[PDB]
């Protein structure tokens, strides 16, 4: 998979347009293959058009949390869902807590077209 199709698969859900059921993360972490080998401790889904998300790569350039400088912060807050493992999880069967939030996202961008390949953070 290209890094861009992997970002869409791990972090984009343009159809929700917010996580209204708290069963959402349990059934989207599985749906997007994030529980195939182990429990991914944390992951964020973005509920905006892909045009709104890809357009973040031309907005405020900020520093990636690992030191790199090709990360970008969104102009307006975006609808996101934080998936977090509960205290009761473990990998046969992964259990996740769902939190709907409206935050700005930060992504690392690459390529032509210049698009998000890593999800860095929320503010």
């Amino acid at each position, epitope marked *: 998979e290209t890094a861009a199709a992997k970002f869409e698969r791990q972090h984009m859900d343009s159809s929700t347009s917010a996580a209204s059921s708290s069963n959402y993360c349990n059934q989207m972490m599985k749906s997007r293959n994030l529980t195939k080998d182990r429990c991914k401790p944390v992951n964020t889904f973005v509920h905006e058009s892909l045009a709104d998300v890809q357009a973040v*790569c031309s907005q405020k*350039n900020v520093a990636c949390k690992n030191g790199q*400088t*090709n990360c970008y912060q969104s102009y307006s807050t975006m609808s996101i869902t934080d998936c977090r493992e509960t205290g009761s999880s473990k990998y046969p069967n992964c259990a996740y807590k769902t939190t709907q939030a409206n935050k700005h996202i930060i992504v690392a961008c*690459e390529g032509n077209p210049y698009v998000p390949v890593h999800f860095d953070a929320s503010v």
Partner: nanobody
Amino acid sequence: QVQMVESGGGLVQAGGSLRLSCAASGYAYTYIYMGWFRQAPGKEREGVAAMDSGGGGTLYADSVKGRMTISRDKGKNTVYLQMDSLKPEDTATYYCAAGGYELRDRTYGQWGQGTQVTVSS
């Protein structure tokens, strides 16, 4: 829309000197990293020099350190390449790029149209 604006290239004798200027206008913030890449006829595109918005993070390609000097207006979206002692192998189109990391080609999403530099022997 972010206009990339380059100038300073053209024809120059071997052992000669040139100064490339590049400015990104219409960007509401400050590209942390900007730099120069170059491509020749046939040769694949390669990195030349790169510098961060503080004045640090300075990096040159192993083929041009000592002959070439990057600089930026601190905090501003401008980048300059002073080239001295020029060889015929420096002949190439020089591209200004903004918003990536070091000389990592895939990480910049802003590229200028390119400034032709030709160095006769």
